[PDB]
């Protein structure tokens, strides 16, 4: 009707993401004091021109809502500089991660561990992952001794680096367009409840308008190529609707797997399970099928050398 894509002998209609689908960037800052007290607390060096890349995307995509999901202990002057950025660029909306409610996606760690202890103990002795069982029982024991109410959100809230960025990235994309409405962003043009979202890594340069994308069941992700290898990546995630069943599958894996990774399980696991890229299927074929491709998305050049 408007396109079709094939993977593992199943046809998937290309669903449109209209030119109003918001863009999303993420900046979670551990050390905001490294920036001036009156500076936008986003990295903007010639090695990492992230603030420039966000602005350049907002300049190109005039009609489209541009989200910047931020977190960290920003000074009063750094929040005013972020407030001023939303004024210089009408389509830029700064969303503080602390202003969103993720409790509907949460689960208690004690519930996950008990489920898995019961699942593993039902198995016969000749198939039981005896190392994993001991580790889970150990993880449960530390929860009951230190923080018996610890959940996926509270535990991920304490982690450092990418694992906490990746965790909230998945949950924001499950909210989709609703997240801008929940955060009380005014003047979001054509932004609909139940609407999708397009996450972009800040090291990527938009050089032209995306227009309308056509993606298999309304989802696609970045596929990175390094040397002669390719890999599913979370550097780009495009969904045409809130609560996309492939990301919902990724969350269900987080709710059942004892040490679920937001990237490996929440995105790669969710996608693979959803489209039946089983272990007996061609990973390379799935990458070509699910890959987000657009002529106006440019890979970071600053990385490169001889």
Author numbering: 26 to 331
Structure paper excerpt:
The long-wavelength beamline I23 at Diamond Light Source overcomes these limitations and extends the accessible wavelength range to λ = 5.9 Å. In this study, we report the determination of diverse protein structures by experimental phasing techniques carried out at long wavelengths on beamline I23 at Diamond Light Source using S, Ca, K, Cl, V, I, Cd, and P as anomalous scatterers.
Using this protocol, we selected 10 projects solved by S-SAD phasing at the beamline, including soluble and membrane proteins. Structures varied in size with molecular weights ranging from 14 to 114 kDa, sulfur contents varied between 0.9 and 6.5%, and diffraction resolution from 1.8 (detector limited) to 3.4 Å. The overall multiplicity for these datasets was below 26, which is four times lower than the multiplicity typically needed for S-SAD at shorter wavelengths (100)10.
